[PDB]
Swiss-Prot record, chains A, B:
Protein's name according to its UniProt entry: Beta-lactoglobulin
Subunit structure: Under physiological conditions beta-lactoglobulin exists as an equilibrium mixture of monomeric and dimeric forms. Interaction with LMBR1L which mediates the endocytosis of LGB has been observed in PubMed:17991420, but not in PubMed:23964685.
Tissue: Synthesized in mammary gland and secreted in milk.
The gene coding this protein: LGB
Disulfide bond sites: 65-156, 105-115, 105-117
Function according to Swiss-Prot or TrEMBL: Primary component of whey, it binds retinol and is probably involved in the transport of that molecule.
Species of the source: Bos taurus
Length: 158, 158
């Protein structure tokens, strides 16, 4: 279970452009295939005035790169959002400095977990990846992926 | 380029049973799919009297788990073997204690690299994984997988 949250998170300040630099998951099958369920690439975070968090995503499905929009609804805890879908899915914000990196996890209630290291630019931020790997020491992850700057500038990181 | 080799390697002492606990590679496509080219599971190392290193492997191909035998031929350096195939492929032994763990990499001469953490038993050896992650700090890896003890006891780690 993810216990790591961002104290004093200001959700309006995570708005805008992000790159999915690194991804990790509890199960190999969540990230292995181009089309695996957690292989989702962030384009934009769009907080609402009410304080919900909209994700603009890309996903490989039916041999191509589709736009997806997910709304994660606010809870009583600022760093935790709930995705209305068939299953009880939580989004947790682990850590961010707003200007360079943001760490988040998706988790279900069976237990499945997928986390990402987001960065503001198409660059390999070794300090952000250090914070990401420190966070995942606490988590039972079995696959980890990372992308180069060329991939980061392509649709679905091809 | 892998510069890390086992000083004073005794190849006859790596004989016998091994488990592919963890795998990492330079390119996501080498390890992502059940059938990806570097997704090969070690069963046995069989040194020859002449000092060549035979690998007994499992590989997922055509929706099933096949036996494969590879011979890596000795070179003038004890920790480096050459696989006779269409391409110039090297096997490097990075580190081993013979009794618990062995770290090795396959590399080509384009550059592609795939490494594994082998262990003698179907257990998660955190100290072996620490040595594996230390070795990979020197290498440009973009995917990392690890297996649980249940998977380690199944054909092709299903």
């Amino acid at each position: 279970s993810v216990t790591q949250t961002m104290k004093g998170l200001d959700i309006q300040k995570v708005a805008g452009t992000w790159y999915s630099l690194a991804m990790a998951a509890s199960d190999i099958s969540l990230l292995d295939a181009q089309s695996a369920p957690a292989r989702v690439y962030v384009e934009e975070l769009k907080p609402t005035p009410e304080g919900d968090l909209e994700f603009l995503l890309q996903k490989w499905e039916n041999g191509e790169c589709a736009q997806k929009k997910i709304i994660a609804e606010k809870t009583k805890i600022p760093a935790v959002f709930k995705i209305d879908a068939l299953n009880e899915n939580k989004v947790l914000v682990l850590d961010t400095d707003y200007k360079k990196y943001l760490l988040f996890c998706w988790e279900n209630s069976a237990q499945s977990l997928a986390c990402q290291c987001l960065v503001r630019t198409p660059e390999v931020d070794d300090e952000a990846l250090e914070k990401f790997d420190k966070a995942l020491k606490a988590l039972p992850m079995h696959i980890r992926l990372s992308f180069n700057p060329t991939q980061l500038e392509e649709q679905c990181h091809i």
